[PDB]
Design a protein around this ligand. Sequence first.
Ligand code: HEM
Ligand code: HEM
Ligand code: PLP
Ligand code: PLP
Lengths: 491, 493
Amino acid sequence: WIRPDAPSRCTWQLGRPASESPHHHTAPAKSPKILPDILKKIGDTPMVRINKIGKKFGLKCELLAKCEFFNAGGSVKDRISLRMIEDAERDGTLKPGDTIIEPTSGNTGIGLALAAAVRGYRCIIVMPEKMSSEKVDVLRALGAEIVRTPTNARFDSPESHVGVAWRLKNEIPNSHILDQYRNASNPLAHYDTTADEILQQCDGKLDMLVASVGTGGTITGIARKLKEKCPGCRIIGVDPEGSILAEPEELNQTQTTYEVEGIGYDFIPTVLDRTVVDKWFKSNDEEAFTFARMLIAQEGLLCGGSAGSTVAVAVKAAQELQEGQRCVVILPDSVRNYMTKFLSDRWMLQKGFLKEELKKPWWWHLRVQELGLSAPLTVLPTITCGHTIEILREKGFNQAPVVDEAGVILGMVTLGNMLSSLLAGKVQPSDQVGKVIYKQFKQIRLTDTLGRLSHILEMDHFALVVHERQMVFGVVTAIDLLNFVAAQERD
Amino acid sequence: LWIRPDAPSRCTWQLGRPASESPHHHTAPAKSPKILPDILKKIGDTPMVRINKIGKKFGLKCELLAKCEFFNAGGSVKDRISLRMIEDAERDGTLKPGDTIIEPTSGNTGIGLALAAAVRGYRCIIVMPEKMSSEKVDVLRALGAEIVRTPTNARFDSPESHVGVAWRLKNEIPNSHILDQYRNASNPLAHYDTTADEILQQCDGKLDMLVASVGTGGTITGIARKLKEKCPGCRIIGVDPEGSILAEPEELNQTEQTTYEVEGIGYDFIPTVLDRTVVDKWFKSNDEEAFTFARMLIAQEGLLCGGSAGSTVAVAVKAAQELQEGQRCVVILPDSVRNYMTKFLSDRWMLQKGFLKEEDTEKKPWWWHLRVQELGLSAPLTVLPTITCGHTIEILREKGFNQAPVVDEAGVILGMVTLGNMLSSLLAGKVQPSDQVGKVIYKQFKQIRLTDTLGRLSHILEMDHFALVVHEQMVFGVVTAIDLLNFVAAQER
Ligand code: HEM
Ligand code: HEM
Ligand SMILES: *Cc1c(COP(=O)(O)O)cnc(C)c1O
Ligand SMILES: *Cc1c(COP(=O)(O)O)cnc(C)c1O
């Protein structure tokens, strides 16, 4: 069992000529008209300007974002995943058909599983139980085997993702742990490609770089190349509360687990070089999710939580900067991984990140009863179509809920939809109503708030106002709510 | 005031007319600058990637190419028509700053419009069918769009249709516009001006067949017109889901079903922007093919694409059979998996909708149909949450055990504790020997019956590290993935 946190043997120091390096470096290559495979769609990520958030927090500087979620697997990890594989293949260590085992937060696991799916390697991912199910669905779709570990497990312990990875490797023939925590290919990928891209996109002019830290490879490779080729740039590292990566140690004193995925650790990875980070900042979950949501709402960037942590620090750290200067921020991954988490309001409420006291209009806190409802006529599912047309027209009604003999509501039926279906030949007048019933709806009480109705209308067209039996006091749609509000506008 | 989406087109284009005769304003593709002023500039210039396995699996002799449109900022092909429709409107003077934009949609156009709206400062109201995925709703809600739903089976003629509701909303809201993807020229024109140029440039002009799934029809129309002009020999193949009426000849459209699970393609009316005259041949697709093939695209080619992409490739492996070596077939891949994370990507959904037969287990190894009891379980010693750490260390060492489930005085299982985690926590000073075990407890686990299959266990281990074997109260044993591995490998020798 090799320790992920072993002190680095690298003899790099600022000032050493690049010629002195023992490592194999790879030049970035121009993308061909047609891509031989998707793995070539890694790198050359866009550098987009942040237009609102910085000014909202008083930055005078240009704030730029390196959007890494445009990589083929959707994360910054797709970079090292490729590199680590390719170098291994050149080492002769990785043979065709071989098994790759990797401890991960998920994104490296996705990149590796992707490359494995393409290049024909077996892939076993070992990730903590905290990480999102979306990553699991993706990994499962890529054909990767999945193993989980308890979140709070110490890295020293056998139950940790690293430990489980090694224990798996020992039992499986032709298996390798590329080990992102130790492999040089990880920071070197960012030293060779990512930093070059940043330097090229910025024309060499660059005042500050903010990056969240996990394995530390991104900030390490980028900071090393930046210290060499753009010495004045300040390197700002971001570490979650509960993590120990940050310096000075006094900052780390604190919670031990946190909701944000992909950053922070209970050990210092070998690839990480804390010497090149000029200053550290601590971040928390609330900041992270708040800012990520802000990134989406304001800048249109569909990025994940670490991106939010990063920007949340950047609006603080960049205050010292002034006009004409620029701050670049790394945005490690997409919202795809967190669709049911921070993107979801219910999860944010459930986790206590969103207080209910959720910016709303005057009508939000009003009861539905004030809408001016009218109780509709009810019909059986077994009633026939033309008959319903006659009933509805004869009473001047345009729609009727479909309720069972036992009084359970089955759905909704409309005059216009019926005429349309009949005129089109889709159904017969003698045909049963079930052929054209709108089966989907949601129920509400007279004492429900209008805003609750507004949330309900984002999933359903119809909302039936009902008693506690077969009793529909009224039917409300978005158009009705609109009509009420708009009528109230006229006064 | 209700304009029909299915009104016959007024366009007087016909193959052979000089481009100079066109009344429309055309936009040239531009080189992307080093730094993007905003994310909307990250639309277009989508990669053309080669399919390496699937075509050969189905006996294609030709080069199969994919125009991967899911790399657009909003994640779909619709981001193109969203930008264009807006920009043109802004040039028309029709769209004013701060104005409200209402749009009927399957979602992707709505996401692109909501994105652009969020950037450019428009109010955005999306009207989409109840069938469409919750993921789209979550994204639209995050982008700040107001959202309204309509019944899936509502006829387009009916007041309850997304089109009809969109118009009805428009009539009640001042300073509101419906850009209308179903009628607006900016939709197909966006594909004629940009997407098609990209395909032509990426293919160096050489292109034998193009397969595209159809929705509003703007993609296939805009691409096919320019292709018919600049690459006449290329065949245009359209994909239409069963239950839809877009396909020709009408004989193909005859079907029992009217709704289908696949999102973004097919309609109960012929959109004005669609030009069926340029479609050389149509193919009908179903949900099973679509999802199977989408999953195949992910599993084999590493392309994280949605269901319409699956429909398209599923057609392509049929339609391209006539092609031979040296010829190439280009396929459109409209959107990403992000919209379908909890649908076809999710195995439980595929089971629930009946797309996945359980039998097709058959893919699985020998040990899959074996009971958990055969693992060689041993019942562990349990401890109270309230027991202290060093005490437990002593008990476990004295018994030769390495771990103990933590069960309540009431006998509810609270979790798990391992000797190694305790020792590690102690040596690090995180905890004291006199400290409560609950400071170090592994709270998360899953239960299983002794009669459960090993494969079920294998599914469980993808969400939890520990699986407790239990009766109805009592823990017969603790199993991890390593234990399953040791068992299988042991039986293997
Ligand atoms: C002049 C430049 C450099 C020199 C001369 C150098 C030298 C070395 C040497 C000799 C080792 C192996 C030591 C041993 O195992 O005995 C090493 C390891 C390593 N290097 Fe470098 N290095 C340079 C730059 C870099 C850069 C720029 C990066 C990343 C951005 C990097 C990342 C690593 C990593 C991650 C290891 C593994 C450490 C370990 O296994 O303990 N190196 N380097
Ligand atoms: C020489 C080329 C073309 C000419 C002369 C032409 C002419 C026209 C004219 C005159 C109209 C409006 C008729 C009216 O409102 O009175 C029109 C509408 C339209 N055009 Fe074109 N067009 C050309 C090419 C195209 C192309 C290449 C596309 C898309 C790929 C296109 C898409 C549309 C659409 C969607 C409409 C709306 C139809 C309607 O309003 O009912 N046109 N075109
Ligand atoms: C890995 C990862 C990081 C951190 O990158 P390092 O290069 O490991 O610092 C941040 N965010 C996400 C989502 C990640 O997966
Ligand atoms: C819109 C859409 C299509 C079809 O595009 P048209 O250009 O409308 O034919 C296919 N798939 C998805 C996901 C879509 O959103």
